[PDB]
Structure formats: C-alpha cells, structure tokens
C-alpha cells in the first residue's frame, strides 16, 4: 500500500548478429552452438552484485530498455518469457531463478568458458561451463520468431565471443551435429556486434535519435514460388520457342568458342571438347530436347506472370542483321548468328524488372526442390554435408549470384524485344513503425520567439514541428489538432490534415523550426531558406491560439536517424545567423545549464484503467440483490453504427490474489467449513447474442504484454524447466507461463444465437496451489497447478459481437468464500461478498510515454583477432533510484514522477507521515525507518 | 536449522572459533525477496564476536560454519531468528530470513 | 524428389569384376547424364565417366583401366562394370543424376546447382 524506493544498477545487452530459427520449408539448420569466455569481473562494485548472464533470446519479444521495467529493474537475460539465461548458479526464465546442481557451483569468474547449444527439432537449450554440463535444461518453448545469442551485463565486466572458427576458436569441441554460429551469417551482411534495440546513438555532432528497425521473420527464409508449368502456350511452343532455342544455342557455342573450349566429336571436358561442335543444333538430341524445355518453361513463366505474350514484326527481326560474325569461330562450328537486338530495341526499365522477377522465380523453384531434398544453408560450401551457401531466397541473395542468374535472361529478353514481344507488367504493428520524441512538459512556452533545428541524416519519413502537452502517443503527428508539424519526405504541412507545402528534403539538410507566439506564426526554413507555400505565404501556419503551450516534437519512421539541436550552444547552431538571429528569435534552451530531458513513446503494452469518457466502451457497477451477487458489466456504446470499431479486448481486474508461501496441503453452508475453507469463487457470464467462441476466461500474471489482435489459446507463452540428476533422469519439471485461461467455444461445441447466457466459474485454491474451471455447474477437464508466492489477476479476452457482452460476477458458492476475502486482509473472514471502490476493470493499451535516461552505459566492442574473436567491455558505473509499485510487481524511475502528479503527491504525503511517526524523539521508530530509507538513498 | 549454500569459492580451512572478531558484508531480506539489511549502503563491514550471543544464534552458527573469503547464502528459520517478536516496522512476526554473507579479514 | 540408390563395388582382389547397379526413382522430368563421382578418403573428389541419355559417355583422367558403363532410360538404371582393380582406386562412389545433359547447362548457376545427389557405396581394393 506504499511505494518502495531503492537504488539499482544499469544493465545492458549485446547480441552477436546471428538469427536462427525454423519453420515449414525453411532453408536453415535446426542445431546451433556458440561460446563465450570471461576475462575480467569486478564483484560488488557500486555496492551491488555485478550482472552477467549468457544465453539465447527471441526477436519478437525480447526488447529491454535502459529504464527499470518489471520487478525491481535491471532486466537482462531470463527476466522475460522470451529469453533464457545462465549466471553460474541458476537458470533464468520468467524472472524466476531456479538453482542448478552444476559440478562447480560457483558464480561466473575470470577464466570461465561457457558453451551454449540450441536444438530446434525438439526445443531445448543446454549450457556447459569449462566442459562440465549443467543438470537443468529449458524445454517446450514457443518456436515463433528467430533466436540469437545474447549477453546481459552491468558495468565492470569484460567478455569475448568465440563465434565459430573465423572469429575466435572453440576451447572445447562442439557436440556432434551442432553447427557453429559463424555459419549462419547472411551473404549480404558481415559479422558485427550490436545492441538489441535502441532509440538513440552516439554521433560526431551529438546524439542521433533513431527510430524502429526492420527485423526479419522466421517465414522469410521459406521459398514461395508460382506454379508456372501448369500454364501451356502451344502457339509459341510450336515455332517461337525453337527460335529462342536456336539463339540460345548460338550464345552457348559462342561462349565455348570465346573460351579455350575445343572441338571434339565426343564430350571431353578434359581436352575441352565440344560434344556437338555443330552450328545448327541436332534436334533429335535429348540435350536439344532439354533446351526445348528451357524455352517452354520460360514462356510458361512469362504467361503465368502478368506478361502478355505475342508476335509483332517478326519479319523485322528476320530482316535485320541476324548473322553477325566475328570471324574468330572454330572451323568445326559454322557462322554463329548474333541478332544484336539491343541496337534495334533497348531493354526498358519494365523489361529489366521482368528479367529480375523471372530470375527470382527460377531461383525460388530451385530453392524449393533443394529444401525438398533436405539441404540447408551454410556460410561455407559443403556438398557431402548438404549445405549450400546459395539456397537463401532471391531477396537475400547477393548481387553476384543475381547477375549470374540474370545475364542469360537479359539475352533472352533482348531476343524477345527483337522479335517484338508485347509483354506488359501486371494494429499492433502500426505502433512498431513510428517513434515520437518530445521535450518534457515543464518546458512549455506561451510567449516569445523560439527557434530550434533538426537534421535528417537518413532520407526518409520524419515529421518535425511543435506539439501540445496533451499530445497522445498512439496518434500520428498532425492527424489531430495537437500538433503543427512538417513532413519533409513528401513536402506536406500537417495539422488536422495534410496539405502540400515546401519541397522534399535531402540527406544532411537541416530544417529550422521557428515559432512566434506574439504573431501566432510558424516558419520552417530549409538550409537557411524559408520554405514557400503554394499561395505565396512565408508562414506555414497562422492564426494559432496560444492555448496551454507548445513543445518541440519530432517523429521518425522505420530505419531512420535524425539529429535534434535545441540550441544549448549557439556555436553548434547552423543557419541560425542566416535566419532567426536578427529577427528576434532565440534558440530553445539557450541559458539552460543542463540538457533538456526528452520523453519517447515506449511501445510496451500495459494494463490501464478504462477511461469514463471512452466513446466505444462503458462499464457499469451493478449492486447486489437477494439472489444476485455484485457484478461489473461491460457494454458497447457505439454498437451497430457506421462509425464503430470492433477489435479484440483484453480486460483484467485491478487487484490480485496471492498464493501461500508454503503449500501445507489443504444451500445451507456449515460454519466450520466456512471458516476452515481455502478455495475461492469467481464467475463470468457471457450474455445471449455474444458468441461463446470469442471469449476466453481465466487468470493472468503481472507480466502480460502481448497485444496480438488474432489471439488464440495456442499463442500463449509456455516453458518447462527440467532439473535432472547426474544420471540424467529428471527429478523436477516446472512449467512457467503467463496466461491460464479456457476457451468458451469448448463448452458450446457440445451444445446460432442461443437465449441462455453462459456462466463459467473459476475455482481457485491458495493452499494446494490449483485452479479448476466449471461451466453451467458442469465439471470440466481443465486443471492448472502453480508454484507458491504467485499472484494472479482475473481477466477476460473478448471479441465484441453484441450490444451486451460480459459480466464479471463476484459472489460465493456453497461452502466457498468469495473473492473479497482473498483480495482484502480486513475482510479475510467475511462470507458476504462486496465490491469496494478499489476493485476495477482495466484494459490493455498498446503505447505509453516514457522518460529517457540522462546518461547511458558506455560499452566498447571490437575484435582482437582470429585467435581471440570479438571483445566487449564496460567499466563506467551508472546507477538510478527506482520507485516500486507493490501490487503490480513493477518499478519505475523516481524522476518519472515529474509528470505523474498523483503518485508524486502520494509519495510526498508518505514522506510526511514518515517524519511524523518518528517526530519528537522516537528513536525506537527512527531506527526502524532505516530499514525502509537508508543512508545511500538519502545521500543520492 | 540454518541452511548454507555456497556462491563463490573461498580461502578454506579457516573457520573462526569462539573468541575472535569477524567483519562481514551481508545483505538480508524476507522470504519474498524484500531487502531490509545491506551493509554496503552504510559502507562499513559489520563487526561481531562469537560466544557473546550478541547476534542471533542462527547468524552465529551460519557465520561459524563457513570459511574465510567465502560468499554464502544462509537461510535462517524464525525458530533460530526473532520469529514471533520480529521487529516493529521491520520484520513481520512470522518470516524466514535469507542473508548473503561474505566473511573476510578474520582476526 | 529423385533418389539415386546405388549398390555394388564389392571388395575383392585385383583383377576382379565389380558390377554396380544405380537406379534413379522419382519425377519423370529431367533425367539425363546420370553419372558417377569418386572420392578417396582424405583426398579430392573426381568425376568418373558419366553416361548420358542416348549412350554418350563423358570421360576424365580416372577412366583408365577396364571400365564399361551402360544405361537404360526406361527405368533410369546404370550397370557400371569395372574389371581393373588398382590399390589407388579405393574410394567412396556416388551416383548423381541431374537435368543437365551432356555436362552442359545453358542457364548458368541455377541449373548448375540443380543437381540430384543420391546415396552412394564404398569401393575398396586389397
């Protein structure tokens, strides 16, 4: 009931840029293995145990941030259901540490080598240290997404990555069948150490704000070709395809003649002998037939795509000089004809795109049949190992293979042009594309002439301008009345709509934004030249009401970087003297001693209370009667209207129920059972007209941030940590997850719109540790068992398809105590159900604001050489004070209270009470207060 | 009883007998991971004798069980701890304590 | 998927006769020039004489001795007979079929990579 404070460390994370995974028809390998060694560790630096964990991570969900986050902060590997780690004593997953009976049983130390192996066929991650295997293994985890090696660490630790054989050498031999991680590097990119995700970067001029980064998916490695052999083109196959085959034979033999290749009646590659050595290909030859399959397949693919085949002036092709001779041909060969159709008709851009897609399809089909054979991808070719470095999709292929597969198709397309072909060419992810940066709301200005600058390092989609303090993180910049912004990617001024203005920018050009609150004007200057409107007005916007104030704001698209210069140093301000200096405009934050703190829209979904003014949803608190318990009903305001939105809804209750520390076993209702029971009841009623197949009823853990709009019961996170003895037989097997629900369609399958409402009850036991489900008084086959010291929130996921959807009923059954006793200590023995004001329904929200730290960890990474591999080191301490919310089991920065005006007031009154209780010489309580607020916190 | 689990290797073969002073750097928390002692924030090692019973019996037995330079996690039950008495405003009247202790500089 | 099952190349003394039967089972398209590769243990891989549809054989430097290679395209079978065993002829022998005919590809890299490498056998000379 009171916010906690403590000092924590900053923990960062580094990956090796190797993404692996599996799917149906993928070209990747299902077994991997890598090595990390430790050089320097300084324990207990800055009065806190040094963080150091090595393991794997998932691209989809593992997105740590420099702030506090879940738990008490300092999240690393294993503090989420998307990563699994190993610190020396325990295996980390889901922020739970389970000790492992390793041979060494000691924390990570200098001169320690850790080998990690991953199996995707049967999902399993195993670790070993200095050749000694650990007893515990992770199993049965979700295979969605791609896996990459990862290390999390605080300051004062130096490590080296033995990635395969090219970069470092393995201290111990890999287990059989486990490929080194150096083999999974894509042909387009080289090996490079990098952080997982970031919203800023160090640059020459200063910090560069970066936006979202595009990431590959596990389904991007599969080939998806088009069945072109089904389509047949007899009118071309009769004559046109043999004309194409004739010229292909011409070019083929031209290649041999240009090469050292000699003429010989029998094929002798040793003496370079030409098996045919005839100018006109002998048609009965099965090789000539296979060239007929050449032409046939090419025409079939052309017709299968959007191309329209046809003949236009083939007599013109016959009329031009087709028999172009170089007089260098071998005396066995005849006059090799060169049509030279390029001079008559060059390849159009559309034509070269057609060549590109034809080559892409031709490579995709081959990749598909190689996958059918059972080949895989490797950085080094190994024919006996069924590894090919060229079976990646055509998009992932390098340009050398592209041109090698493109040259012959370019010649064929030139022949087609010469013959005269008439071929003619034919919710959650939204937040992951745009990141918004803005200044703190304490810097709002309501008067004067202010100026700041922005630099577009990468030509792309960014929007720079001024915004209101109320500006929401979900909405795009300028889509509402809360932002006057300029988009230089297309040259559009944006405020409650988009209108053309100015011109698009380039890379490296600086745009200066100037606001004049005396004249109510906004001016955008590109490289010192004022951008011009179509009408002929220098002001982008005018007649602007001051209102509550304005703040600088900028938004960046995917893979974009930008340099924002508020103007703390005038010497670093460009074009300010050109425009703004003599016009009475001052740089933003000119006399400020410290740099301006900025806020960014973090994309981590979290549960927030349902606002009372929400236009689409309304929650009613219905009281209890003689035969009905208290209940919270959900309704749709805008149902059955043109301007209505229907989507998946994730709702929970604001208060949790916590299990016992130790599981010590354990009509007219009998009082001994009433005051000796431990089970609790909680029901959900789905109204008539709402499909039972679109509701999920159960419980959730405090760590649930999955906002997938196509939620299925098979998309929930789940892992099993298995601890075995030395002999290998497992003695422990613990399941971990974050969502224990059932599906309403299961009860309705056994049996359109039904009149009867569906009541589903969830029985919980806080002593045994199990929860069961019942439907309409009928026992179900679904049971769940959980570990002690676990707190769960009741929750429902619903797809609204009716005016009235769901009702949270909070009552009691026979010999069963209601949820009020479980939630509240003061009512622990009250059989009468009740709903105090604290109990409330909360909805999942995708985006929220967050505060960027003032200082960041300085991590230095390089490569020592092939003997030592890549090296990572960090040695600068960095701490922060965290504020912890007890019930939600999550913390936040103490400096974030500058905008949270309610928690700040509550904490100030808490401090006042702290002084009051120990006031007037109560030393016995002053001593006790030290365990809550300590000397280090006070000095900090 | 008191349960001892090693964390890092120690010097070994140096166990303080009755009558010496010992300085330790310790961090103590509830069963539910609620930190309430940390000698590092005070930036001074805790000094204690053995045999004077100034510290709780569980802490004394745990400290005497380990060796020099060793880091050990000690789980102390309420029986060998304050237990029912606890501490007003600090410790609940029923809790099991977990203390990480790094014994060093034996004298 | 076309699989080449090859059986033969038994271990006998020098001068013996070895019959190797290779059968390609799979798709009906692109079955030409199905031939033989050899690889000595710890040595480079070489190409043995490869027969093509129409009874055309492409020879190399390792065809020395008494070889005879015949094929039938009705069942995609090859009956390779060796009568000259040499101590340097001990190797793993693989039977490989592909769309490429007479060791030529008018496409380039794609069809070159377009090979159907089946299982192989062991040839040992005392």
User: Distance (Å) from the C-alpha of residue A89 to the closest C-alpha of chain B?
Assistant: 8
Nearest to A267 among C56, C108, C114 (CB): C56
Strand locations in A560-613 (E)? 561-565, 586-587, 598-602, 606-609
If you count residue pairs, one on A and one on B, with CB atoms under 8 Å apart, how many are there?
49
C58 touches A at CB < 8 Å = yes
Q: Which residue of B has its CA nearest to A48?
A: B40
Cα-flanking dihedrals φ and ψ of residue C103, to 5°? 50, 40
What b/e sequence results for A800-828 when a residue is b if at least 16 CB atoms lie within 10 Å of its CB, and e otherwise?
Answer: bbbebbbbbbbbbbebbbbbbbbbeeebe
Active site residue B15: no
Q: How far is C-alpha A332 from the chain's CA centre?
A: 63
Active site residue B79: no
Return d(Cα C37, Cα C119) in angstroms, integer: 11
A243: nearest Cα among A302, A180, A294, A191: A294
Please state the three-class secondary structure of A768-809 as a single string: CCEEEEEECCEEEEEEEECCCCCEEEEEEEECCCCCEEEEEE
* Residues A175, A48: Cα–Cα separation, whole Å: 36
For chains A and C, count residue pairs whose Cβ atoms are closer than 8 Å: 77
Euclidean distance between CA atoms A630 and A614, whole angstroms: 23
* B6 contact residues in A (CB cutoff 8 A): 105-106
Q: Which residue of A has its CA nearest to C99?
A: A290
User: For residue A777, which phi and psi values (nearest 5 degrees)?
Assistant: 75, 10
- C26-32 contact pairs (CB < 8 A, 24+): C26/C1, C26/C2, C26/C116, C27/C1, C27/C2, C29/A293, C29/C99, C30/A290, C30/A293, C30/C98, C30/C99, C31/C2, C31/C73, C31/C76, C31/C97, C32/A286, C32/A287, C32/A290, C32/C97, C32/C98, C32/C99, C32/C100, C32/C101, C32/C102
Q: Give the residue ranges of DSSP H helices in A691-781.
A: 744-748
Question: Which residues between 66 and 85 in chain B have a beta carbon less than 8 angstroms from any beta carbon of chain A?
Answer: 71
Q: What are phi and psi of A241, to 5 degrees?
A: -70, -30
Does the distance separating the beta carbons of B89 and A6 come in below 8 Å?
no
Distances (CA, A) of A623 to A609, A687, C52: 20, 18, 88
Q: What residue in B sits closest to A938 (Cα-Cα)? A: B41
Burial category of A381 from C-beta neighbours within 10 Å (exposed 0-12, middle 13-18, buried 19 and up): exposed
The answer to whether the beta carbons of residues A213 and A559 sit under 8 Å apart is yes
CB-based contact, A940 to chain B, within 8 Å = no
- DSSP letter assigned to residue B45: P
User: What is the phi-psi region of residue A156: left when phi exceeds 0, alpha when psi lies from -120 to 50, beta otherwise?
Assistant: left
Per the CB < 8 A criterion, the answer to whether A635 and A620 are in contact is: yes
Give Cα A558 distance to the centre of its chain.
12
Is A159:A37 a contact under the CB 8 Å cutoff? yes
A922 to A913, A916, B90: CA distances (angstroms): 14, 10, 15
Residue A605 main-chain phi, psi, to 5 deg: -65, 140
For residues C57-92, one letter each, b for 16 or more C-beta atoms within 10 angstroms of the residue's C-beta and e for the rest, the string is: bbbbebeeeebebebeeeebebebebeebeeebbbb
First-last CA distance in chain A: 24
Gap from A373 CA to chain C (nearest CA, Å) = 6
Asked if residue A3 lies in contact with residue A910, where contact means CB atoms within 8 angstroms, the answer is yes
* Residue A405 with chain C: CB contacts under 8 Å: 107-110
Distance between C58 CA and the closest CA of chain A, angstroms: 5
Judged by CB atoms within 8 Å, which residues 2-41 of C form the interface with A?
29-30, 32
- Cα→Cα distances A205→A351, A455, A553, A855, A870, Å: 44, 11, 20, 17, 28
Range of the domain at B19: 1-107
How far apart CA C99 and CA C114 sit, in angstroms, is: 7
Q: Is C76 on the interface with A (CB under 8 A)?
A: no
**Euclidean distance between CA atoms A52 and A49, whole angstroms:** 9
Minimal CA separation from A650 to chain C, in Å:
47
To 5 degrees, how large is the angle CA A435–CA A437–CA A440?
Answer: 145
Which residues in chain C touch residue A407, judged by CB atoms under 8 angstroms apart?
108
In this complex, is the C-beta atom of C88 within 8 Å of any C-beta atom belonging to chain A?
no
CA distance C22 to A892: 70
Q: Which of A822, A701, A720, A813 is nearest to A761 (CA)?
A: A813
Q: What letter would DSSP give residue A236?
A: H
Q: Of A105, A661, A928, which has the smallest distance from its Cβ to B90's Cβ?
A: A928
Interface touch B6/A936, C-beta < 8 Å: no
Q: Which chain B residues are within 8 Å of A789, Cβ to Cβ? A: 32
Q: Is A401 on the interface with C (CB under 8 A)?
A: yes
**Residue in B5, B32, B35 closest to A6 by CB:** B35
End-to-end CA distance of chain B: 27
d(CA C103, CA A298): 21
Residue C114 at interface with chain A, using a CB cutoff of 8 Å: yes
Contact A934 B40 (CB under 8 A): no
Closest residue of chain A to B10, computed from CA coordinates: A106
Q: Are A661 and B31 inside 8 Å of each other by CB?
A: yes
Kindly determine whether residue A290 and residue C32, on different chains, have CB atoms separated by under 8 Å. Answer: yes
Q: Does B6 touch chain A (CB under 8 A)?
A: yes
Quickly list DSSP for A805-861.
EEEEE----TT-B-HHHHH-STTTT--S----TT--EEEEES-EEEE--SS---EEE
Q: Give me the sign of the Cα torsion angle A108, A113, A118, A124.
A: negative
Number of domains observed in the structure of chain B: 1
Q: Could you tell me the CATH number of the domain that includes residue B97?
A: 3.10.50.40
Q: Which stretch of DSSP H or E encloses residue A658?
A: strand A657-658
Rounded to a whole number of angstroms, the distance from the CA of B107 to the nearest CA of chain A is: 23
Test the A interface: residue of B39, B89, B96 with most A CBs within 10 Å:
B89
**Contacts with B90 (C-beta within 8 Å, 6 or more apart), sequence order:** A928, A931, B36
Strand partners of residue B38 = B27
B99 in active site? yes
In the PDB record, what is the listed experimental method? Answer: cryo-EM
CB–CB contact C56 A370 (8 Å): no
Which of A651-668 are b and which e, b meaning 16 or more Cβ less than 10 Å from the residue's Cβ?
A: bbbbbbbebbeebeeeee
A106/B7 touch (CB, cutoff 8 Å), yes or no:
yes
Interface-testing mutation among A223, A227, A265, A267, with chain C (most C C-beta atoms within 10 A): A267
- Is the Cβ–Cβ distance between A487 and A566 less than 8 Å? no
Q: Which residues of A293-322 are buried (b: 16+ CB within 10 A; e: fewer)?
A: ebbbebbbbbbbbebeeeeeeeeebeeeee
Phi/psi-derived region of residue A183, left when phi > 0, alpha when psi is between -120 and 50, beta in every other case: alpha
Mutate to test the interface with C, among A286, A385, A410 (most CBs of C within 10 A): A286
Other chains touching C, judged by 3 or more CB pairs under 8 Å: A
Q: For chain A, say whether B3 makes contact (Cβ under 8 Å).
A: no
Closest residue on chain A to C1 (Cα): A373
B82 is an active site residue = yes
């Amino acid at each position: 009931l009171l916010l906690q404070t403590n000092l924590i460390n900053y923990v960062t994370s580094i990956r090796p840029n190797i993404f692996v995974g599996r799917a149906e028809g993928s070209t990747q390998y299902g077994k991997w293995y890598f090595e990390v060694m430790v050089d320097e560790v300084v324990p207990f630096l800055t009065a806190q145990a040094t963080h150091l964990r090595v393991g794997w991570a998932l691209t989809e969900g593992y997105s740590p941030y420099p702030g506090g986050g879940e738990g008490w902060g300092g999240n690393g590997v294993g503090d989420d259901l998307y990563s699994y780690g190993f610190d020396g004593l325990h295996l980390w997953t889901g922020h739970v540490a389970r000790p492992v009976t390793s041979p060494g049983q000691h924390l990570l130390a200098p001169e320690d080598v850790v080998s990690c192996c991953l199996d995707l066929s049967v999902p399993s991650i195993s670790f070993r240290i200095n050749g000694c295997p650990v007893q515990g293994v992770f199993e049965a985890f979700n295979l969605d997404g791609l896996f990459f090696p990862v290390v999390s660490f605080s300051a004062g630790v130096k490590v080296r990555f033995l990635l395969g054989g090219r970069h470092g050498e393995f201290k111990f031999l890999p287990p059989p069948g486990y490929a080194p991680c150096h083999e999974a590097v894509l042909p387009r990119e080289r090996l490079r150490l990098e952080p997982i995700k970031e919203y800023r970067r160090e640059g020459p001029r200063g910090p560069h704000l970066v936006g979202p980064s595009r990431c590959l998916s596990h389904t991007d490695f599969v080939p998806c070709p088009v069945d072109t052999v089904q389509i047949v083109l007899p009118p071309h196959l009769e004559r046109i395809r043999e004309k194409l085959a004739e010229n292909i034979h011409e070019l083929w033999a031209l290649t041999r003649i240009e090469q050292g290749w000699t003429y010989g009646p029998v094929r002798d590659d040793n003496k370079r002998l030409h098996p045919c050595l005839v100018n006109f290909h002998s048609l009965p030859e099965p090789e000539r037939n296979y060239n007929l399959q050449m032409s046939g397949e090419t025409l079939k693919t052309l017709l299968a795509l959007g191309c329209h085949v046809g003949m236009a002036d083939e007599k013109a092709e016959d009329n031009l000089k087709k028999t172009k001779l170089p007089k260098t041909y071998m005396m066995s060969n005849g006059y090799k004809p060169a049509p030279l159709d390029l001079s008559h008709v060059r390849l159009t851009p559309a034509q070269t795109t057609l060549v590109d897609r034809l080559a892409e399809n031709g490579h995709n089909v081959w990749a598909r049949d190689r996958v059918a054979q059972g080949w895989s991808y490797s950085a080094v070719q190994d024919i006996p190992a069924r590894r090919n470095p060229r079976l990646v999709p055509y998009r992932l292929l390098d340009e050398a293979t592209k041109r090698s597969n493109r040259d012959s198709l370019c010649q064929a397309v030139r022949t087609l042009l010469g013959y005269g072909y008439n071929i003619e060419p034919p919710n959650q992810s939204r937040w992951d594309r745009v990141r918004i940066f803005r200044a703190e709301k304490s810097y709002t200005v309501q008067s004067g002439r202010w100026y700041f600058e922005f630099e577009a390092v990468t030509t792309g989609e960014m929007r720079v301008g001024w915004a209101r303090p109320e500006l929401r993180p979900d909405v795009e910049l300028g889509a509402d009345e809360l932002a006057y912004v300029f988009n230089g990617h297309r040259g559009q001024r944006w405020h409650l709509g988009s209108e053309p203005f100015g011109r698009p920018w380039q890379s490296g050009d600086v745009v200066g934004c100037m606001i004049d609150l005396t004249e109510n004007t906004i001016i955008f200057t590109l490289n010192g030249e004022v951008l011009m409107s179509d009408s002929g007005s220098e002001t982008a916007f005018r007649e602007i009401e001051i209102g509550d104030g304005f703040l600088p704001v900028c938004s960046l698209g995917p893979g974009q970087v930008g340099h924002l210069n508020l103007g703390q140093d005038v010497s670093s301000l460009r074009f300010f003297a050109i425009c703004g200096l003599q016009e009475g405009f001052e740089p933003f934050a000119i006399n400020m001693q410290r740099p301006v703190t900025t806020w960014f829209s973090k994309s981590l979904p979290q549960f927030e209370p349902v606002p009372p003014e929400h236009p689409h949803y309304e929650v009613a608190r219905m009281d209890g009667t003689v035969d009905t318990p208290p209940c919270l009903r959900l309704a749709h305001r805008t149902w059955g209207s043109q301007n209505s939105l229907v989507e998946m809804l994730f709702l929970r209750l604001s208060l949790p129920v916590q299990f016992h520390q130790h599981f010590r076993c354990t009509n007219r209702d009998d009082p001994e059972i009433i005051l000796n029971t431990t089970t609790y009841y909680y029901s959900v009623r789905v109204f008539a007209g709402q499909e039972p197949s679109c509701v999920w009823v159960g419980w959730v853990t405090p760590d649930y941030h999955q906002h997938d709009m196509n939620f299925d019961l098979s998309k929930v996170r789940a892992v099993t940590v298995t601890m075995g003895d030395e002999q290998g037989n497992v003695h422990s097997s613990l399941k971990c997850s974050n969502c224990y629900m059932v599906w309403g369609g299961d009860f309705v399958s056994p049996g359109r719109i039904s009149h009867t409402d569906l009541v589903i009850g969830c029985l919980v036991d806080l002593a045994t540790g199990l929860m069961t489900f019942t439907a309409n008084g009928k026992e179900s086959n679904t049971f769940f068992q959980v570990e002690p010291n676990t707190k769960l929130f009741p929750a429902v996921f619903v797809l609204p398809t009716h005016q009235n959807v769901i009702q949270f009923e909070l009552g009691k059954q026979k010999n069963i105590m209601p949820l009020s006793a479980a939630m509240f200590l003061s009512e622990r023995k009250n059989p009468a159900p009740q709903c105090p004001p604290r109990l409330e329904v909360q909805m999942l929200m995708p985006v929220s604001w967050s505060r960027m730290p003032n200082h960041f960890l300085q991590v230095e990474t390089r490569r020592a050489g092939e003997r030592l591999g890549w090296a990572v080191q960090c040695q600068d301490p960095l701490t922060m004070m965290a504020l912890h919310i007890p019930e939600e089991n999550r913390c936040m920065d103490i400096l974030e209270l500058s905008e949270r005006l309610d928690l700040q007031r509550f904490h100030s009154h808490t401090l006042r009470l702290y002084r009051a209780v120990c006031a007037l010489g109560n030393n016995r309580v002053a001593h006790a207060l030290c365990s809550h607020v300590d000397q280090a916190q006070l000095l900090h | 009883g008191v349960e001892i689990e090693t964390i890092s290797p120690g010097d070994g073969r140096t166990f303080p007998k009755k009558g010496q002073t010992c300085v330790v750097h310790y961090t103590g928390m509830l069963q539910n991971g609620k930190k309430f002692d940390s000698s590092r924030d005070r930036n001074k090692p805790f000094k204690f004798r053995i045999g004077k019973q100034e510290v709780i019996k569980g802490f004394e037995e745990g400290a005497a069980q380990m060796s020099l330079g060793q880091r050990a996690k000690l789980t102390c039950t309420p029986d060998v701890a304050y237990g029912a008495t606890g501490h007003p405003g600090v410790i609940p009247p029923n809790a099991t304590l977990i203390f990480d202790v790094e014994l060093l500089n034996l004298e | 998927q076309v699989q080449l099952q090859e059986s033969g190349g038994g271990l006998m003394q020098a001068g013996g006769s070895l019959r190797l039967s290779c059968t390609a089972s799979g798709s009906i398209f692109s079955i030409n020039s199905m031939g033989w590769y050899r690889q000595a243990p710890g040595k480079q891989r070489e190409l043995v004489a490869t027969i093509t549809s129409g009874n055309s054989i492409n020879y190399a430097d390792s065809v020395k001795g008494r070889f005879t290679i015949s094929r039938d395209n009705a069942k995609n079978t090859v009956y390779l007979q060796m009568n000259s065993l040499k101590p340097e002829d001990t190797a793993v022998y693989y039977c490989n079929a592909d769309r490429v005919p007479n060791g030529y590809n008018p496409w380039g890299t794609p069809n070159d990579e377009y090979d159907y490498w089946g299982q192989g056998t062991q040839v040992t000379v005392s």
